[PDB]
Amino acid sequence: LWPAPNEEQVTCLKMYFGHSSFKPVQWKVIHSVLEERRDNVAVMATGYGKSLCFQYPPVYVGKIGLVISPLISLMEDQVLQLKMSNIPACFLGSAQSENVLTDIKLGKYRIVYVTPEYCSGNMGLLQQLEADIGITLIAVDEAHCISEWGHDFRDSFRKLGSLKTALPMVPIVALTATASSSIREDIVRCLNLRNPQITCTGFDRPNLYLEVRRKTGNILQDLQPFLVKTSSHWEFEGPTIIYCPSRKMTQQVTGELRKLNLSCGTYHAGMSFSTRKDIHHRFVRDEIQCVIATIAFGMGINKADIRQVIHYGAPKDMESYYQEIGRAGRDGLQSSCHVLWAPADINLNRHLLTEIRNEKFRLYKLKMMAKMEKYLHSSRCRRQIILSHFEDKQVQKASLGIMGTEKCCDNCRSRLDHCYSMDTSWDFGPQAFKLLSAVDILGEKFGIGLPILFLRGSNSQRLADQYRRHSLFGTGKDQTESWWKAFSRQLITEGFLVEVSRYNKFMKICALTKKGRNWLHKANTESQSLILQANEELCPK
Numbered sequence: 001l002w003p004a005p006n007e008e009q010v011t012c013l014k015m016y017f018g019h020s021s022f023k024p025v026q027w028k029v030i031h032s033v034l035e036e037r038r039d040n041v042a043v044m045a046t047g048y049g050k051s052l053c054f055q056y057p058p059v060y061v062g063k064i065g066l067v068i069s070p071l072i073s074l075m076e077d078q079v080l081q082l083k084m085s086n087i088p089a090c091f092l093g094s095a096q097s098e099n100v101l102t103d104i105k106l107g108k109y110r111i112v113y114v115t116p117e118y119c120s121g122n123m124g125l126l127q128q129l130e131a132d133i134g135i136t137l138i139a140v141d142e143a144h145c146i147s148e149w150g151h152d153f154r155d156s157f158r159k160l161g162s163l164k165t166a167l168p169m170v171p172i173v174a175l176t177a178t179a180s181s182s183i184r185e186d187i188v189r190c191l192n193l194r195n196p197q198i199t200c201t202g203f204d205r206p207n208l209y210l211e212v213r214r215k216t217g218n219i220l221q222d223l224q225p226f227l228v229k230t231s232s233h234w235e236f237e238g239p240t241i242i243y244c245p246s247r248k249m250t251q252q253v254t255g256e257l258r259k260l261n262l263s264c265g266t267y268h269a270g271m272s273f274s275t276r277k278d279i280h281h282r283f284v285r286d287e288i289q290c291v292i293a294t295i296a297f298g299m300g301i302n303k304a305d306i307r308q309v310i311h312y313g314a315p316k317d318m319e320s321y322y323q324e325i326g327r328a329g330r331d332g333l334q335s336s337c338h339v340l341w342a343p344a345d346i347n348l349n350r351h352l353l354t355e356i357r358n359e360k361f362r363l364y365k366l367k368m369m370a371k372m373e374k375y376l377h378s379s380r381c382r383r384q385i386i387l388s389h390f391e392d393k394q395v396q397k398a399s400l401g402i403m404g405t406e407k408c409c410d411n412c413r414s415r416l417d418h419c420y421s422m423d424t425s426w427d428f429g430p431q432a433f434k435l436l437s438a439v440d441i442l443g444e445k446f447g448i449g450l451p452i453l454f455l456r457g458s459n460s461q462r463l464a465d466q467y468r469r470h471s472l473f474g475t476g477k478d479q480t481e482s483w484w485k486a487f488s489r490q491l492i493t494e495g496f497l498v499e500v501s502r503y504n505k506f507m508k509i510c511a512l513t514k515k516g517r518n519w520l521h522k523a524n525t526e527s528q529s530l531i532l533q534a535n536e537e538l539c540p541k
């Protein structure tokens with residue numbers, strides 16, 4: 001067990017990064033790299049705090065940290081974010097002046113961003129910085145690009161194996177997307193890491209509700225369910241990102257949203273630094289409500305309170321999908337992630353990959369598109385399927401407290417609205433709330449029959465038309481009369497209802513108990529649960 005940080009370390013974190021404490025895995029990596037000078041392979045979920053692991057140590061000791069990445073636009077964005085935290089950083093490339101390079105040699109910058117190509121060609125420069133200043137760490141983001149079995153291989157990374165040779169005292173921190181053992185093996189062997197610490201944060205984002213819908217045929221019909229008509233104009237429910245597979249589909253979606261006068265912006269690769277800066281400005285400040293994006297990184301979609309992610313079209317793969325939905329709910333508030341898809345979507349098109357020569361690669365793409373289509377068509381828990389892919393193992397639904405609840409995914413939410421089996425211990429809270437309310441709404445003056453007719457939307461004359469205006473009228477048609485009758489007998493046995501006759505023995509009423517009235521009081525103001533021992537009559541297999 002590693003030690004807690006000292007006060008000087010915490011003070012540095014507050015002054016430069018505005019955080020009052022390290023996250024657990026952040027400190028795992030930081031202490032290992034900063035104080036133990038040990039190589040690291042770190043797998044961090046979306047929105048955990050990956051960048052702090054390599055930005056903080058060079059700031060704390062006032063030396064240089066080298067960040068190797070192929071995403072030039074992302075390195076530009078992070079440089080700006082660092083300077084706005086009073087941290088000097090720069091992107092080093094062939095196009096840079098010697099004044100920037102001489103300021104680097106004098107130690108004016110804490111964090112230096114380079115591409116893999118520039119790094120392979122200038123190993124002598126790296127050794128000079130190590131002798132004169134000292135390199136705290138070398139970060140290799142997108143480290144899965146080092147070998148084939150990742151979702152995106154690059155050849156420029158293979159020459160990073162000389163870093164350990166030219167700099168055997170400098171620890172390397174490699175960041176990758178999944179906890180895949182095979183990918184981690186390749187990173188260690190190709191980067192020449194020496195017994196590195198292996199850390200994984202887990203991948204669950206419990207505040208992200210997951211849903212998958214089929215496309216309806218036209219864009220406006222697909223998107224209008226996500227809109228609210230305030231006054232006499234349309235609005236998104238909250239800040240929204242719409243991911244499109246192509247620029248063409250981006251323009252089509254934009255053209256349709258403009259029909260409703262929705263405030264929208266686009267986000268693509270190859271945009272200028274000024275364009276990305278302006279999009280970030282408008283999105284963060286809620287001057288645009290929706291960003292329609294074809295990329296999943298950068299300033300433009302770096303926003304804390306994104307409430308809704310929409311994939312318009314099947315996602316490319318599970319890794320892209322996870323990163324793309326990972327942009328939502330970074331403030332901890334409840335967010336929703338919807339995929340709108342059809343079998344003809346371009347990312348599910350097996351027509352356009354017959355012409356790839358590699359044997360294992362073509363089979364990988366076929367299995368990925370089959371895995372994607374299986375997830376989209378699945379009736380089981382969306383969250384369990386996603387967590388299984390990134391843990392490289394079958395995940396149990398009992399591992400996290402979010403699975404199986406109404407805020408988990410659409411397939412879990414369907415089971416709470418109309419239960420089914422796969423001892424039966426199930427949450428009948430939603431159904432009990434309908435029944436116990438109907439008993440109290442009708443005044444506890446009739447038998448259980450009238451509340452049942454109320455819930456099933458009966459046209460009977462026993463029910464006064466004043467009750468047909470109610471919200472619950474007809475919301476129980478999912479269950480038969482005998483089901484509601486049998487469910488009421490379980491509420492009598494458990495002790496939430498009782499049958500009672502007063503002086504008039506020709507009138508039997510069904511009334512709430514003390515426990516019944518107490519439960520309904522809490523359920524009026526909070527979503528309450530009610531666990532039961534059931535029969536296959538209640539939740540059939």
Ligand SMILES: Nc1ncnc2c1ncn2[C@@H]1O[C@H](COP(=O)(O)OP(=O)(O)O)[C@@H](O)[C@H]1O
Nearest residue numbers: 019020021022023045046047048049050051052
């Ligand atoms: N130690 C910390 N305490 C609290 N919040 C943090 C900490 N480290 C990072 N964060 C926040 O987490 C958010 C996501 O971090 P970031 O590195 O941008 O995620 P990603 O690695 O997915 O891009 C950031 O807005 C950042 O402010």
Ligand SMILES: [Zn+2]
Nearest residue numbers: 002003035036
């Ligand atoms: Zn230690």
Ligand SMILES: [Zn+2]
Nearest residue numbers: 381408409412
């Ligand atoms: Zn679920």
